[PDB]
Amino acid sequence: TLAELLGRSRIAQVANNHKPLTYTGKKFHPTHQIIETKPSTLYRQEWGLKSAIPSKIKSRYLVYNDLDTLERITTFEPRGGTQWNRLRFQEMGVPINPFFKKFNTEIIGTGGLSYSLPGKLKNSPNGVIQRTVVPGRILNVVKWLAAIGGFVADVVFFQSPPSSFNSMGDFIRMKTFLFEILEASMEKNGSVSMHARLL
Amino acid sequence: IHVVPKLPNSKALLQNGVPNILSSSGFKTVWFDYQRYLCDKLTLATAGQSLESYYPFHILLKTAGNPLQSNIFNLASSIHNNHLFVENILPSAKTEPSRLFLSKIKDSFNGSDWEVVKEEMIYRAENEVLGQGWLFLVENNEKKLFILTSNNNGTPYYFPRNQSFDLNSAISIDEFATLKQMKELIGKSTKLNGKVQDWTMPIICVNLWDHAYLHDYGVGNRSKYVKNVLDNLNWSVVNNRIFS
Amino acid sequence: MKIQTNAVNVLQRTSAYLKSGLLKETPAWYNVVASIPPSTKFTREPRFKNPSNGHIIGKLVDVTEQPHANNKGLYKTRPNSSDKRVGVKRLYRPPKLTYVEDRLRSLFYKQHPWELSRPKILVENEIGDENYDWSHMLQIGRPLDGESVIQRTMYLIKTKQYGDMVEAYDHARYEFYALRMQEETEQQVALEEAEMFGSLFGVSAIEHGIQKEQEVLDVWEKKVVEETELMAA
Amino acid sequence: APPVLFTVQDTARVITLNRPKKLNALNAEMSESMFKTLNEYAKSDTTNLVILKSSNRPRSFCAGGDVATVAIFNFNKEFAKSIKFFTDEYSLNFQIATYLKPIVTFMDGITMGGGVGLSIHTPFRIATENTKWAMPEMDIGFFPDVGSTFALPRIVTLANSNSQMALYLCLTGEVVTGADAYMLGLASHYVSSENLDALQKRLGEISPPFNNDPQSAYFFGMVNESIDEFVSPLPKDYVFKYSNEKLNVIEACFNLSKNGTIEDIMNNLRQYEGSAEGKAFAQEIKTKLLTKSPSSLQIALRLVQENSRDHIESAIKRDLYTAANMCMNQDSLVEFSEATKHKLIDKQRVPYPWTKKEQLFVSQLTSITSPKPSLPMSLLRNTSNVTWTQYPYHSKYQLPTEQEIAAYIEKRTNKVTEREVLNHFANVIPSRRGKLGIQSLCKIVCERKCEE
Amino acid sequence: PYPNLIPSANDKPYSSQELFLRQLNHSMRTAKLGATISKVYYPHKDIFYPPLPENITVESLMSAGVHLGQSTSLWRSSTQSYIYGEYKGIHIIDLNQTLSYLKRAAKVVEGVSESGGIILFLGTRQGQKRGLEEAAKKTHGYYVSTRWIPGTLTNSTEISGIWEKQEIDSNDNPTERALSPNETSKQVKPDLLVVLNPTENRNALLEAIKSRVPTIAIIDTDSEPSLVTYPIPGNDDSLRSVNFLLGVLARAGQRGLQNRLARNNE
Ligand SMILES: [Mg+2]
Question: Keywords in UniProt for this one (chain E)?
């Protein structure tokens, strides 16, 4: 019947949610399913939703709340950013087990951020990679805070900050540093707490 | 879904393989099972994504510059390569090299004969491909035919993914300087994806994977298999692959 | 808007024109419309069953059919005020379609918020072309996502291999983890093996993010300096 | 409640069979009420078409006639009541066949015996996924009774050039289900059950465009088109039940001259060398035909032989005479009531042991299909009172026959390709444009009846 | 094949144009090697390979998104009988009814094209031009996608009277006969109007009513059904759903035209 197909249809596969699309609080994890389109469908404003998305949207990713509203629009944001954070984490290689052997709503383990298992070495043309080096940005004078790969992490120094820190001041974020991501756990709220060290 | 293409004369291919190269159980291993295995894996790696709408050549060009999609690239490469190879060894869809092909051999390989270039290809495959890989005779934008050996699932179209050097073992300073120059040229591109133009196209492709020769030849004897391949190419296809 | 009369009776008015002689030639559509009549009722039609869950619409349970004490211990001996109100509106209200999977789709993405970051394509290929055996989770023509888990859960329930939805859902979850770990190891090892054979990549994800942050931060610096200078004056 | 319900849908009149427990088994009360009410509707100028359906919608449309009472009317020797029963039933069938207004039959569920009679004589007969069509009279010691011997030699599409597929269906009593009945031409349209409500509304709305004559071919075309609007594609993983090989088996083995006997068919079944599986299918038929009534087999054979070349009125009269004689059973030639007792009153799975095994002589079998002086009989007059050799509207609004496919292919001889025939029968003939299964039917016919 | 191209000399490399032709030769032969793609939706194919009306299923209407109706807050209750239910804050259109109405409308289009009547395809939303043009060109019909001038039917003399007209034979072959000014000045009224967005085209619907032209339209959850002769319940907001229904109607018209030419060639 039509009802069974509707229950199995791709729109039905997206779980209902009405969280604000313009949240200004703290973001620990994704809140909205990212919707993607191919170039061929985007050329025809086709996204598998009810209504054609406006031609102004050149990006191939969006998030949305309502297919249609009393305002005769679809409530959406042309953003798919949270996928690039996840992939960047996958590039770091630092791992984070409940993935091994009435309903509980709490996040299980990592909430899908990473499925990599703990103990493995990264072979390289030099040799086994002993530690993971990643570019980052020191944020503010404070363990300092660094923007690394879409995540805010805690920076610890070998001995003390260099002169560039206080030379630049609040413009310290303009320059790129190298960090060693020591470790990465996740807390109950669902937030990843990476510990790094400046180099 | 990506599906294995239907080959001309499939019944004869399943009954008697390719004469002078493969038995029936060898061609079944290299095409009717390996190509199915690869197409299933590509389908599982690209289903529900944009790449599902693209042919493997377009997939490997799109994913060539993205480090995290390498597995897809590998699949999309091998599939493509595996049909470039099979196509140019199939009995038919007595073919001989065209005048243009031999002319370009004389203008590229120091005025050498085709058999001499075949022996050079045997040697190149024997040495520079330890284990799995592909052997190619490719045409660059300079109208020059040269021999290219990729490891595993490197592609002949896009030089940053040729994978012509095995960095597991020691390399000569010449190879390291080549890698440094290619890295600098990659960095020279302005496109945000970091891609480069590369008009190299394959003329001849030989599958050096164990799925091709192991059953019919053995652990050694891959040189014999490559020789049988190059002595029994489908020259209609190979001649069509060269721009007139 | 008033139910219009003159769109569905074009044949009758045209035939009046033709019979009177006001119109000489019969139009090309005339015989076609005469042979294919329009629907001209435009009625509201009742419905007696919810299509999705099979709930019957428009049944009243009588007091005779409740012979047992309710949860508060009281028998039902006469109709209540709800039973005495005519519920004809429910027969015409388009029913709300409901599926247990939606409750189970909400749970998965509450337990795996980063599975929302995996892009999803809502453009259907062809719903009729799907021939899935949900005895396993991986399907040719499908991605691995929450819907695989939930369809496997529903399959396990309808075959009674599990009695409780919770246990079937947990089993599907663990199969999903088994497949995801394999996929991620495949990706990482593919990249490692590619680098070991001289694959020269350009910009990676981290460098991509760094360059976008730089593009934004240059404009931010300029605005900050301009605003500080303006504030000083 | 009354065994038949009559209702109105804005111009159509709906006749609902209303005996759910007995699966809408047809009676003389039911037949008489239907016959008289159809006689009334034939005169009404506010009636455009009649719909025939069942209240027990999914399980059954009409699960045969209620011949158990006919068998008790003969255990108590009340032969006049059996005569009245068959007179009513067959006069009703004759009325439906010759009705001048469209009749639409919803064969949603089991359709057997009297049900086929109610449904087979109308140009508009709709099968659904639930349609279970059969003609199981051979095992109760009875014959194809409802004009089936007249209809099946004419309407069946495949392997029916000499009524041999009709003979297979009649003698074996094979249950033909769903889209197989549509593809064989036993049903004229194929509509999902969920749609039959909407179709019923649509059939209640359409009227003749002007001059208000619902008896014209124009209105039959309109009804055909409105039914076509509710036909949905067959499921992708659907295959016709009888492969080309089994159709070859039927065509070879049930072919006969106009003097062929059941012994000829048995010899053909024994002496078949088609293929491995198609030779085992002939053995299956051999086996199950041996569980049938020897006398009923021959009676059905001669009835098909004569009614496949006769006109409708005399064919139905011949069925009436045969039923009367079989109930009389003067010479104990046929064990009808004795086996109807066996299988419709005790529900004994084991087949009734047919004591009377003989090859009835042609004259010993001609007197069981003829009028009689000691007991005159006649069908009841209806408003049409016409007769014909071929159906007026059936061929237009069902799938084409192999005969019509051959007529088109042989008109191009006196260079054709598959595409020509498929595109012709699919696109150009107006009443059959976009007809559901033209492509596959034409492929089957071309695959097993010509070479190029 | 490729005139006014000057090849290069064997000593010197390929030029940009030679590289283009070389990679075209590659693209048509070897670029598609490795695998064939199956069961994947390609947006252009709805326009160039629309199915026949008899082959349409509920599943293919649903994959096109025809079932997705307007928000329940914008419901026009006169469309109540077309609705299957509500799901995720929108009304779902009953696709069984959509299929029945679509087959009826397709048969009307086919019958009108088979009779040599004029068919007009009206759709004024953003990306509907391609489908409208192709429907018109395969039905030998006409289309508008820019704007419906009010009075195009009821004031045809003041609007369409100046544009040129043409005599054609049974095979639709231009006769190139000279028309009289009186003949050129006459109204040439469509025999069938099909509108893809009837809510934004009330002027056209009312003119068709006054000018007594039967009309087909895609009727969404907020649209008035009684304003058209042959409604098709469906989503009028998605270009995929609109193009699917339009391609179906265009193919039915094409089949009618082919039948007309067939009998006129016999
Ligand atoms: Mg709308």
Answer: Mitochondrion, Ribonucleoprotein, Ribosomal protein, Transit peptide
